[PDB]
Amino acid sequence: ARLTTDYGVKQTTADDWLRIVSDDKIGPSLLEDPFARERIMRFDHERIPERVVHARGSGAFGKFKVYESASDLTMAPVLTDTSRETPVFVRFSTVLGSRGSADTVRDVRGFAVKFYTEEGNWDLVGNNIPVFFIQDAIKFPDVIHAGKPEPHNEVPQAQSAHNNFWDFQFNHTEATHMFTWAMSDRAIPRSLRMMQGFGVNTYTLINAQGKRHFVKFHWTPELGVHSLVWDEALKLAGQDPDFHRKDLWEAIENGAYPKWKFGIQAIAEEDEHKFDFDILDATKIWPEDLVPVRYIGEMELNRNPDEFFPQTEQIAFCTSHVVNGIGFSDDPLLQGRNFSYFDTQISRLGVNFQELPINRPVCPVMNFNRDGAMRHTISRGTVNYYPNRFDACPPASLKEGGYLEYAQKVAGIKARARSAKFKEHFSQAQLFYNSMSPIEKQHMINAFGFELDHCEDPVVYGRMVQRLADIDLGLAQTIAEMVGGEAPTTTNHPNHGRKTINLSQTEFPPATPTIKSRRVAIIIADGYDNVAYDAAYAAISANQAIPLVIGPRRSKVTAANGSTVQPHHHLEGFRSTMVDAIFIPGGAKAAETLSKNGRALHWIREAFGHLKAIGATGEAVDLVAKAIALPQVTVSSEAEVHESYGVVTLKKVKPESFTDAVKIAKGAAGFLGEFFYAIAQHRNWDRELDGLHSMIAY
Amino acid sequence: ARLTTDYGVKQTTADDWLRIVSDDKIGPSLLEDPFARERIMRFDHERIPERVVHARGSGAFGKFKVYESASDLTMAPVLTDTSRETPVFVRFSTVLGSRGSADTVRDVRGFAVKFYTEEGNWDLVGNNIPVFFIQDAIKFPDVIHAGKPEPHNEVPQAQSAHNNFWDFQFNHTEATHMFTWAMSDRAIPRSLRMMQGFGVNTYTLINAQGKRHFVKFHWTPELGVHSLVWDEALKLAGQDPDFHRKDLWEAIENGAYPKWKFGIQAIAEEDEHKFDFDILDATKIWPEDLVPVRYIGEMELNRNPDEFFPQTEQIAFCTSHVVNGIGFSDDPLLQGRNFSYFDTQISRLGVNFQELPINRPVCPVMNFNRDGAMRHTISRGTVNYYPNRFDACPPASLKEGGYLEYAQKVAGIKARARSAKFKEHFSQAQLFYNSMSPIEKQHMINAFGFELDHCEDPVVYGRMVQRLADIDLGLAQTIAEMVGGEAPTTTNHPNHGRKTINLSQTEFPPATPTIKSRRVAIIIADGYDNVAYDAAYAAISANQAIPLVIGPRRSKVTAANGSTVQPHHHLEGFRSTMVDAIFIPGGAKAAETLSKNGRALHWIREAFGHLKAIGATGEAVDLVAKAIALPQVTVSSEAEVHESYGVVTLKKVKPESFTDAVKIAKGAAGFLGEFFYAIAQHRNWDRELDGLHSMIAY
Numbered sequence A, B: 001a002r003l004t005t006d007y008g009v010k011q012t013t014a015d016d017w018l019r020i021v022s023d024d025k026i027g028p029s030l031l032e033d034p035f036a037r038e039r040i041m042r043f044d045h046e047r048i049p050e051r052v053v054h055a056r057g058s059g060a061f062g063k064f065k066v067y068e069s070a071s072d073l074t075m076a077p078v079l080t081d082t083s084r085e086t087p088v089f090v091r092f093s094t095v096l097g098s099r100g101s102a103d104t105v106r107d108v109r110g111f112a113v114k115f116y117t118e119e120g121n122w123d124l125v126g127n128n129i130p131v132f133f134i135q136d137a138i139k140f141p142d143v144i145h146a147g148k149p150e151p152h153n154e155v156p157q158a159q160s161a162h163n164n165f166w167d168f169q170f171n172h173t174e175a176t177h178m179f180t181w182a183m184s185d186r187a188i189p190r191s192l193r194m195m196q197g198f199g200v201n202t203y204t205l206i207n208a209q210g211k212r213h214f215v216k217f218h219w220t221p222e223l224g225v226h227s228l229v230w231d232e233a234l235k236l237a238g239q240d241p242d243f244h245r246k247d248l249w250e251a252i253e254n255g256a257y258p259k260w261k262f263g264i265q266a267i268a269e270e271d272e273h274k275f276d277f278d279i280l281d282a283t284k285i286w287p288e289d290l291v292p293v294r295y296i297g298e299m300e301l302n303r304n305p306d307e308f309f310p311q312t313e314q315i316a317f318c319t320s321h322v323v324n325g326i327g328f329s330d331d332p333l334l335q336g337r338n339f340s341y342f343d344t345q346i347s348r349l350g351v352n353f354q355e356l357p358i359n360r361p362v363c364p365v366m367n368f369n370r371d372g373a374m375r376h377t378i379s380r381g382t383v384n385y386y387p388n389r390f391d392a393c394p395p396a397s398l399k400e401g402g403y404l405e406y407a408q409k410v411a412g413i414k415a416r417a418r419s420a421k422f423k424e425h426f427s428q429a430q431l432f433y434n435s436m437s438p439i440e441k442q443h444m445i446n447a448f449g450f451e452l453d454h455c456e457d458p459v460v461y462g463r464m465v466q467r468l469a470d471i472d473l474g475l476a477q478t479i480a481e482m483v484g485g486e487a488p489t490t491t492n493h494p495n496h497g498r499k500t501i502n503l504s505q506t507e508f509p510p511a512t513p514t515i516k517s518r519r520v521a522i523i524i525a526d527g528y529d530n531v532a533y534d535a536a537y538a539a540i541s542a543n544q545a546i547p548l549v550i551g552p553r554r555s556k557v558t559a560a561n562g563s564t565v566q567p568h569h570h571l572e573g574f575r576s577t578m579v580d581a582i583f584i585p586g587g588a589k590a591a592e593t594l595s596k597n598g599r600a601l602h603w604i605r606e607a608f609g610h611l612k613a614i615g616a617t618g619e620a621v622d623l624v625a626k627a628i629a630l631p632q633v634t635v636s637s638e639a640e641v642h643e644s645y646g647v648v649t650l651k652k653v654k655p656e657s658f659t660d661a662v663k664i665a666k667g668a669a670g671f672l673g674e675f676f677y678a679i680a681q682h683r684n685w686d687r688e689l690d691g692l693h694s695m696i697a698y
């Protein structure tokens, strides 16, 4: 393999333009040089427009398969064939930020899946939140413009924390339910692998008998739904803007393929109007206590892209992409979406975008669509229209798999309006807030407090405080004292207190206790205990977690026993924000050095403040106890394992200390077991509920 | 003013698509609706390709004027007319990051100026660093591809901290001088208003007699050159990705128009070959001790854009844009640049980009260039070529202002090579490192340590450690112990120790002692001393600085005397990273509350760790002393003003405490004077030189 031009001509150098030159005097570059001009020309034109929304995203290849046929709901083979595996490509994303914006901002997350079925491409373009800000697609530009950077100065980037966003939220009550979800932990996921996915809009399924059902699609992570805490999310946005992209790529490269269960909520054609809300209103969820989610399949992502740009950047999804057996509903948000995903591709990619490798279906494509810019397909023949004398490219009958258009009855008048039930805008916002656990409510309170603090206009946060009273009077008061304004004492939208299942993240734990893919920092310094170090390192690896050694330097660290190791990173190059938990082995000399290292002390205090599991043995126990300096947090004093607020310690290490079985469960006996259990729980919320984080500086 | 379509037809609503609907049943949306389709279509196509490099940037309008004619060097009126003011638009930017990437990343900064002269548009497309990574433009794709996110996974965003960047740096020795500048504080400026600008390439100036001079252009900030510290820059990248954009916009909106002195280095045509280095080598600076910078003008930015997208996003600069009296040289980096700025616009904007308002010249444009997409110009006439029978649009003679092409002698052979002097690649890298102050060397050491730590390939950082020995043997050893690898004991490129002027940032202080535009946080809590508060607030404002009140809540805080104030932000919504210094007034109740507030304690510790000025009076003195907990940092014990490492205190406030004159100078007598002096010094470097920051957790 040797360097050539794009037209196949080998070149002797990639370092010099053709110019006039002499040993002692350089001259002008020549216009004739085709190799140099081509290099610069290709470079000059590398960029294409970013997606107008969901510009920042990461994707991977995988497979989908139903383990239970849904033939009673649809005759689409992708959802009825339990023997075939359907290839997919999934792209996750944020919404407001441009291409280089951070992964860990507060925002809705896109969850788009392209199913390459034998019957054509089916795209399920969803989000990680089940509802949306608006009911009619015509207002998408309004809500997006309001959330995006303000027009005059293009500030702020990838943030809803500014005047215009909250101005729109208050003035468009349809969005009430949505901004409540937006302030919840759902908007700051720990990993794209640890969040749900939803079709959001109401679609339809048609079976072999021609019977139709209205449906909602769900994706549920087998690792459970987990989130970051705000201070941590902001730091990561700067310290590692690719945190989620790397998290996904790393897991797949390591063989830890993320999985999601695929579920369907179905309402018979005949019961369309049997609910308080309109089942086609995208600002409404279908309470699972009324319509249960039926899980029938599983999807896993098992292969990273070969090259990001031609695959992840160029992939195009659209709600318009449905296969036989799957259809649309009169959902006024979905109706307009269908128009958009085709239209936008014309300028983003080009009219022949379906020819791009990543977008092409895996089955035969036959029609008379022709030409268009950058056309690769060459079609032989003298005819390109139907009907024609050769009966070339005839339509497919229904029995041959032709798309079935449900003959839905339609009656009414042409008008710019929605039906009666669409007028209800507060009930579910209250239901959602009511269903949140105490810690989740606290996180939402902190979110409103931070967001409205960043609103400079007293009219904006002042009005929002008034709106919050329509969700919960107590919430309004708390926010008012935090950001200003006056919380009303009454409301025309009383909150009756009802709650519902499967909304709180507490109802989505991992399929089984695990710490798979979690990152655990092992903090050391010269003189560390090689014993505790070896035990933890092996146990972390053996439980599919990632051990990351952090030391004062990234060259060599010497253990108390003389053995050495080269850490993955030094204390200044990484931060606790980048890991799930920290472990510090003993070693008097090591503990003393770390106790005088400000950066090291911060690692401990920040890990504590961010509610992460902390484990320490031997002399490191006093290190941690003194670093945190909280009487509420107790530690081991002898050879007994001790746990307090997710802080696991063992002061006196004995021969049996690391011989106990490693059981990831409540009330484990051994040190590693209890430490891993704290990690498996993700974060220690009691630490925050008891205000201990507020006492620490991090 | 009422809502209309783009074709002028008034509409009754922007909330509903035209559909089939009835009171109780919603129906499908109609295809016929032109208003809705237009809304979505315009939205779907809002984005255009981002700039291939310098995609993230901010700009403003301003004016330029020479106060000293350079008629001896050029006959270009823009540089000789001392009575006219030339309008300009300036766009600042980073280089590697995409559009939504953070402002405060470590990177070269773009400093592009478009001069709208009466003789045509002249663009000076420079950077905030005087040299570049390569000597020949043909390699721009190589260095840019190496620094940009790696192709397989598109990681990392806006960072040179990864394998490929350092792989190229080591393998292309021409870049040695440049990466040294890249690791200096120049790459992490505190504000776009506090950095220099350079043309980088060698241009030429031609005077009325036809005599030519080779030149270098310089921009020097009147506010001085100041930088952030790494931990702070990373936090800001996440906490406020628009930090620099907001800093620039705010200053201009407040009337604090940033100014730069414009200077020129000139070498007579006859002395082109009288230096050790080739004066056309862009990897070389012209030592100011050999060729002095002659300042002749001033530029100020005094007006923010009306709308970001059509102005800042669409503005196009190019080195090709030169006016009569200004020309090009055979600088092999400049030669290729000329080709690029025209080429890239074809896909980024469109062939008619010069028609866009922001790009149009302010003088008459007359030629036979025609048509092209989105053509607005309408030209009457039956002729569009020259020569023609009407002698329409004839050329301008030299006396009429026609562009003067210097008849430069050229002799040599056609070849892909550079001349002899271009082969020197290490001398100036050493000179630069040698010229840095102790603190600047320490910051560079920390930079290499952080950057190479983030290189996963032992071959990459291992080789770089070897390369560093070619700059300074001691530097290599220090980095080797920090990141790994083996520092060589010898080198074929000995560092002789010579230094030069005007390289260290210490040689670029503000024109006069000042704190103009600086932000000062005033931290309070219920029970604060209204006296110290009032005094500081007025003094900050009266010295053109910005007082930002930070409290436990953003609703109302009550002073010890019963008066109240609504802070700008609460402690959780902001961080010390966002301000230049902090001041805490007394009040026993306030100091006690803040002493138990972890977030508040962090504000103090972080401000200290980031080397920022800290001021406190009364009970707040003990608050600060205890928060920092360092014996090295002494504080006032009586009614005397005390200063220690930029920490200014006054424990016992007396009637005369705030009646002393406010003198921003070394050894001021009053509290505000010494506090403001600490602020004016930007940061307290002794704090870091003595390792005090290393003892604090922040």
Ligand code: HDD
Residues within 6 Å of the ligand: A051, A052, A053, A054, A057, A091, A092, A093, A109, A110, A111, A112, A125, A126, A127, A132, A136, A137, A140, A199, A200, A201, A282, A315, A316, A317, A333, A336, A337, A338, A340, A341, A342, A344, A345, B040, B044
């Ligand atoms: C009619 C306009 C409209 C409406 C009402 C929505 N969107 Fe949309 N969306 C677009 C118009 C759009 C778009 C402008 O056409 C985009 C960006 C560019 C592109 O390819 O598609 C897009 C992309 C886009 C993506 C990214 C696909 C990728 O990774 O490329 C996701 C996940 C969604 N949308 C999700 C949703 C959800 C869950 C919605 C609410 C039910 C929604 N969109 C309403």
Ligand code: HDD
Residues within 6 Å of the ligand: A040, A044, B051, B052, B053, B054, B057, B091, B092, B093, B109, B110, B111, B112, B125, B126, B127, B132, B136, B137, B140, B199, B200, B201, B282, B315, B316, B317, B333, B336, B337, B338, B340, B341, B342, B344, B345
């Ligand atoms: C031949 C290729 C090439 C070379 C050798 C350089 N650049 Fe360049 N630069 C481009 C090709 C380019 C470009 C690809 O044409 C860009 C981005 C898109 C655009 O409009 O111009 C650009 C933009 C661009 C901008 C942004 C203008 C704006 O704000 O829009 C600045 C400040 C510079 N460059 C500065 C420099 C400096 C100081 C260089 C070294 C002496 C340099 N460039 C070498």
